[PDB]
């Protein structure tokens, strides 16, 4: 169905020629390079680099149109199909590439970044939809749970749902100490901004973290016992002592790492 994709772009080149930005000869060259990619993407042995190459090539076409718009039309934006179509189609290619190759975390990463940069053009709900599929496809990758948590605590500043993302991630990955650290770090960040706001409120006129500390030791110990033991329990009494000792050593380094976290927060006691 390569022709279907080729036909969807016909109104646009007609718009490019109608506005005078691109000559029929130049338009034909863009078409020929476009055609080669579409057959490449639809064929056998297609890889992600084909999607990246097409996205990079298509991005350049957008830049020339923008430059020529000011050079020839002398207009910031011409009200026609040309303005939002190259931008719309790039997202379509990202969907196909991410759909075609769900494994590559790298390709997903540009998709989020590309849509994030065009915040006005892509609603934050569309960024939400991408994350929901991504978290769903790779639930055990901690980096993505902290990813969407970071996006919205800064850009949107929704602590309730930023709490929710970590609250889900810890459900799937209770044994990774990194995820606990970020969810504690977020927790003290919420408290400090709340207290700083309270200080500002007066000028113009935490235990919860310690609880996250408590369980964080317990489950990390449990999982570390589950690992290093394999399928079965350890019969020898002595090893069970080293198993306990190894958790204690593993566990204390986890605790000591948090003692360093406390030092960063001056306001907290």
């Amino acid at each position: 169905k390569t022709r279907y994709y080729l036909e969807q772009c016909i109104p646009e080149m007609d718009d490019l020629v109608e506005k005078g930005l691109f000559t029929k000869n130049e338009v034909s060259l863009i078409m020929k390079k476009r055609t080669d990619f579409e057959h490449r993407l639809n064929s056998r042995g297609s890889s992600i680099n084909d999607y990246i190459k097409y996205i990079n090539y298509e991005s350049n076409v957008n830049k020339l149109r923008a430059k020529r718009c000011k050079r020839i039309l002398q207009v910031k934006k011409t009200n026609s199909l040309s303005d939002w179509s190259i931008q719309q189609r790039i997202g379509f290619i990202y969907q196909r590439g991410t759909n075609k190759f769900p494994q590559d975390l790298k390709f997903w990463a540009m998709y989020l970044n590309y849509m994030k940069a065009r915040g006005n053009q892509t609603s934050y709900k569309k960024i939400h939809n991408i994350y929901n599929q991504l978290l769903k496809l790779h639930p055990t990758n901690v980096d993505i749970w902290i990813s969407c948590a970071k996006y919205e605590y800064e850009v949107h500043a929704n602590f309730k749902s930023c709490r929710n993302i970590f609250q889900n991630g810890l459900r799937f990955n209770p044994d990774v100490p990194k995820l606990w650290y970020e969810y504690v770090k977020f927790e003290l960040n919420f408290i400090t901004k709340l207290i700083n706001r309270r200080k500002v409120m007066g000028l113009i006129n935490g235990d919860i973290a310690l609880t996250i500390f408590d369980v964080c030791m317990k489950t990390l110990g449990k999982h570390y016992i589950n690992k290093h033991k394999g399928y079965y329990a350890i019969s020898d009494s002595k090893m069970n002592i080293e198993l306990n000792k190894e958790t204690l050593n593993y566990l204390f380094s986890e605790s000591l790492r948090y003692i360093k976290l406390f030092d960063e927060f001056l306001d907290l006691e």
């Binding site: 970044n113 980096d143 970020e182 960040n189 400090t192 960063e264």
Partner: peptide, 27 residues
């Protein structure tokens, strides 16, 4: 304001990532 910058920012790597056994002998 200077203190708010000192406060830690949650760190993430995805953005950095973005940029034959059965054969008898022959006599």
């Amino acid at each position: 304001e200077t203190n708010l910058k000192k406060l830690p920012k949650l760190e993430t790597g995805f953005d950095a990532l973005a940029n034959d056994w059965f054969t008898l002998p022959k006599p």
